[PDB]
Design a protein around this ligand. Structure first.
Ligand code: UN9
Ligand code: ZN
Length: 216
């Protein structure tokens, strides 16, 4: 489907009504696989950090670390398909401008590739942008083939601001996700028992970002 059709007939209305939207088979198998290879290459070549310090025991040899990350601009050699993913995300956002709430997106962060090693670590409940730093939309792309939460866990659980119920999102291969970055979407990553890859990009609202500068 053309970016515009997907955006106008689904993303725009979905976001305004739910603020949490999922798009499966975003780029297709071939492209998704190539991205998976680039991300795996980054890992195998030691480009990721050692992982978030989860448990710092008296002894450091036994320390437990979680999600590993690496920032990608999208033009570096070996990550061009990722840059392509980022472009696809952008073209999609552009077709939504003026329709995603009253926000006016004028920029984004670089891509943050994250890898949960599968040692039972997850990510505590949190809000991406709780202090109004400009980020209005969180965009996540998953690259995990044949991922079964019942077996590997790693489920993304979001707790919509008012609703009681929460939404469980599986980090399925070639899946794209959109959700408001503010306090309306507190979320967390349940313990992952298998290698879990995801690529995140945050979009900035023009006004919020402009005055964020003031307050720093
Ligand atoms: O990956 C997922 O399905 C959900 N991930 C997150 O919500 C998430 N959020 C933040 Cl702010 C960070 C921040 C740093 C590293 C990983 C993060 C992460 O996976
Ligand atoms: Zn988050």
């Amino acid at each position: 489907l053309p970016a515009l059709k997907l955006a106008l007939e689904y993303i725009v209305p979905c976001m305004n009504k739910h603020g949490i939207c999922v798009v499966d088979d975003f780029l297709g198998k071939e492209t998704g696989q190539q991205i998976g290879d680039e991300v795996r290459a980054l890992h195998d070549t030691g480009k990721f950090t050692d992982g978030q310090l989860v448990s710092q025991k008296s002894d450091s040899s036994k320390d437990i670390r979680g999600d590993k990350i690496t920032w990608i601009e999208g033009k570096e050699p070996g990550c061009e398909t990722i840059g392509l993913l980022m472009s696809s995300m952008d073209d999609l956002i552009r077709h939504c401008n003026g329709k995603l709430g009253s926000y006016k997106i004028n920029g984004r962060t670089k891509a943050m590739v994250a890898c949960y090693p599968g040692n039972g670590t997850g990510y505590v409940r949190h809000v991406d942008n709780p202090n109004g730093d400009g980020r209005c939309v969180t965009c996540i792309y998953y690259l995990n083939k044949d991922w079964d939460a019942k077996v590997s866990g790693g489920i993304l659980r979001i707790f919509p601001e008012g609703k009681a119920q929460f939404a469980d999102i599986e980090p399925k291969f070639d899946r794209l996700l959109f959700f408001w970055s503010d306090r309306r979407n507190p979320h967390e990553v349940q313990p992952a028992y298998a290698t879990r890859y995801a690529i995140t990009v945050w979009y900035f609202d023009a006004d919020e970002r402009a005055r964020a500068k003031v307050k720093y």
